[PDB]
Symmetry: none
């Protein structure tokens, strides 16, 4: 006898907007000689807009139901890796420079 | 006797919009001599707009139902890898420069 | 006998907006010779706008139901990795400079 | 006999807006020769705007229900990793400089 | 017999706005030769605006229900890692400087 | 019998510039009703750039030579002339002005 | 028998600049009803840039030479002339002005 | 028999600049109804830049030479001329002015 | 038989600058109804920059030479001329002024 | 037979500057109804910068030389001329002024 009543009359819903910005990794790069690494960008974002909507309707009087909703997300990482190495670089974006040297010497 | 009633009358829903930006990896790159790495970009985003909508309807009076919804996501990584190596670079985007040297010497 | 009544009459809902900024990793970089690393950016954001909406409706008088909603997120990391190494760099973005040297000498 | 009544009449809701700023990692960088590392940026933000909305409706008179909503988030990290190393750098963004030297000598 | 009545008549709600600033990590950096590290920025912020909204409705007369809502957040870290090392740097952003030397000598 | 010895070894000359601005007479004139004269603009400028250059060689031991180099310039001027005459002008570049008269009367 | 020895070894000359601004006569004139004369602009400027340059070589032992270099410049001027005459002008660049008269009367 | 020895070894000259501003006659004049004369602008400026340069070589042992270098400049001027005459002018650059008269009367 | 020995070894000259401001005659004049004369601007400026430079070499043992260098400048001027005459002017750059008269009357 | 020995070893000269301000005649004049004359501006300035420079070399043992260097400057001036005449002027740059008269009357 559980009467569930929802009455909607003469409703007027408008202008329901959700906005998100750009998600760029390596953009607008006029520089040079540069190591640029974006390592594992993970995006679980959610942009939504609900207007006059409903969810699930479960009419279960006296039910022995079982419902499992599992979302197992695995992102395990094991890193032993040299990342972003820059060595022995002569970067001259200026003008009129003279006699610029970079020397590396290694014995073993 | 679980009467579930939903009454909608003279509804007017409008302008339900959800926007997302661009997701670019390596874009607009006029620079040179540069190591640019985007390693494993994972995107589980969701852009949605619900307007006057409903979900599931489950009329189960006295049911012994079992429902399993499993979403197992695996992204395990094992990295032992030199990533983004730049070496012995002479980068001269300027004008009129003179006598620029980069020397590397290695013994073993 | 649990009468649940929701009565809506002559409602007027408008201008429901949620905005988010840009999420850029390496953008607008005119500099050079620079190691730029964005390591594991994880985004679980949520931008939403609900206007005249409802959730789930569960009419369960005297039910022995069991509902499990598990969201297991795993991001375990083990890092033994040299990240962002810059060495033996002569960076001259100025003008008219003269006799600039960078010397590295190593014995082992 | 638990009559739950919600009566809405001649409501007028408007201008419900929530805004968020940009979340950029490495942006607008004209400098050079610089190690810039953003290590593990985690974002669980939430930007929302509810206007005339409701939550879940659970009509359960005399029910023995069990509901579990678990959100297990794991971000365990083990770091033994040299991060952000800059060495043997001659940075000359000025003009007219003369006879600038950087010497490194190592024995082992 | 627990009559719960909520009566709304001729309501007018407007201008409900919540704003947040930008959350940028490394932005607007024209300097060079500088180690800039943002290590593990975690963001659990929440920007919301509720206008004429309600929460959950649970009509449970004489129920033996059990509800568990667990949000386990794990961020355990073990760090034995040299972070932000700068060594043997000659930084000359001035003009007209002369005879600038930086010498490093190491025996072992 | 004398010897003029000039020995040049391992020279490096660069970035020699000579310039000057525009020598413009009448330019960018949106005004009206004006009288403009540029009378006799005489230009004998000499914008030169000499880099590693060398002049004449006159090896003349015991010679009776006559070398005459004459540059005779004549600009003699005689003027008895009405230059730049503006008479009986009603210049109205404003807005909404009324009843503007310029009455010029002469007899003989 | 004398010797003129000039020995140049390992020279490096750079960044030699000579300049000057515009030599403009009448430019950017939005005004009206004016009288402008630039009478006889004579220019003998000499903007030179000499870098590692060398002059004439005259090896003349015991010679009776006659070298004459004459630069005769004539600019003799005789003026009996009405220059720059502005008469009977009603210049109204303002707004809303009324009843502006300029009455000029002469007899003979 | 004398010797003029000049020995230059390992020289490095740089950054030699000579400049001057604009030599402008009539520029940026939004005013109106004016009388402007630039009478006879004579320019003999000498903006030079000499870096590592050298002059003439005259190796003349025991010679009866005659060297004459003449620069005769004539600018003789005779003026009996009405220059810059402005008469009977009603200049009204203001707003809202009324009943402005300039009455000029002469007989003979 | 004498010796003029000049020995230059390991010289380094830099950053030599000579400059001066603008030599402008009539510029930036928004005023109106004025009379402006720049009569005879004569310029003989000498903005030079000498760095590591050297003059003439005259190796003349026992010679009867005649060297004449003449720079004759003539600017003789005779003026019997009405320069800069402004008569019968009503200059009203203000706002709201009324009944402004300038009456000039003469007989013969 | 004498010896003029000049030995320069390991010299380093830098940062030599000579300058002066603008030599401007008539600039930035928003005033009106004025009479301005810059009569005969004569400039013989000498802004020089000498750094490590050297003059002439005259090696003349036992010579009967005649060296004449003449710079004859003539600026002789004779003026019988009405310069800078302003007559019968009503200058009203104020606001709201009334009934301003300037009556000039003469007979012969």
């Amino acid at each position: 006898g559980g009467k569930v009543q929802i009455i909607n009359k003469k409703l007027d819903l408008s202008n329901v907007q959700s906005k998100c910005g750009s998600k760029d990794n390596i953009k607008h790069v006029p520089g040079g000689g540069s190591v640029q690494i974006v390592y594992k960008p993970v995006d679980l974002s959610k942009v939504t807009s609900k207007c006059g909507s409903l969810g699930n309707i479960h009419h279960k009087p006296g039910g022995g139901q079982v419902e499992v909703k599992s979302e197992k997300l695995d992102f395990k990482d094991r890193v032993q890796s040299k990342i972003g190495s820059l060595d022995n670089i002569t970067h001259v974006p200026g003008g009129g420079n003279k006699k610029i040297e970079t020397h590396k010497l290694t014995f073993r």
